[PDB]
Amino acid sequence: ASIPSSASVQLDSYNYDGSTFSGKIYVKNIAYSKKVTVVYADGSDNWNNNGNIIAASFSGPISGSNYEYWTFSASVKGIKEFYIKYEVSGKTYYDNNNSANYQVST
Ligand SMILES: OC[C@H]1O[C@H](OC[C@H]2O[C@H](OC[C@H]3O[C@H](OC[C@H]4O[C@H](O)[C@H](O)[C@@H](O)[C@@H]4O)[C@H](O)[C@@H](O)[C@@H]3O)[C@H](O)[C@@H](O)[C@@H]2O)[C@H](O)[C@@H](O)[C@@H]1O
Numbered sequence: 001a002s003i004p005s006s007a008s009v010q011l012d013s014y015n016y017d018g019s020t021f022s023g024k025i026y027v028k029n030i031a032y033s034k035k036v037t038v039v040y041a042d043g044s045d046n047w048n049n050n051g052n053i054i055a056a057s058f059s060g061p062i063s064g065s066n067y068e069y070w071t072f073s074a075s076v077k078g079i080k081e082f083y084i085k086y087e088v089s090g091k092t093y094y095d096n097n098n099s100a101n102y103q104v105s106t
Contacts, residue, residue: 001026003065008093009036009086012069016104022073025056029068031089034058036070039085041101043078052076056084079104 004010004026014023027036036056041047056072081103083096096102 003062003067004028007095008088009084009095011084011095011097011102014102014104016076016079019075020073021054021076021079021104023071024059025070025072025084025095026062026067027070027086029061029066033088034070035085035087037085038072038082040076040082041080042076043080045080 001010001012008028008030010026012024012026014021021040023038025036027034038054038056039047039050040052040054042052054072054074054076056070059069059071061068081101083094083101086093086095
């Protein structure tokens with residue numbers, strides 16, 4: 001992805017190596033305190049009522065923009081698809097890939 005034009009949050013890239021699921025996210029710096037999570041469906045495409053969660057962490061600023069990078073990396077038993085949830089300044093935002101969710105192959 002590119003630095004977004006307006007979106008509060010936008011996944012950039014991700015990888016799954018068989019066990020470790022990781023990635024990088026564009027996050028608008030709306031306010032300082034943020035919660036950025038990756039909510040996923042497991043290997044059988046079970047979303048488990050939004051209970052499969054990885055917390056992302058601040059990575060670094062994006063100079064001259066209103067965005068910053070956040071990253072995540074965690075062990076998962078299995079994963080078919082996911083979206084990003086972002087809470088900041090009392091509001092919840094999502095990047096669910098324009099309703100498609102992000103897919104992990106196989
Ligand atoms: O008992 C099983 C019955 O479920 C089947 O369908 C249920 C749907 O469950 C999954 O949905 C997960 C959903 O998660 C993301 O959506 C996020 C949205 O929800 C937030 O909380 C917020 O309100 C929204 O802003 C946010 O966008 C994904 O983006 C989304 O794609 C996911 O669907 C399945 O993934 C769905 O496919 C299912 O429709 C089934 O229909 C029943 O027949 C079963 O009995």
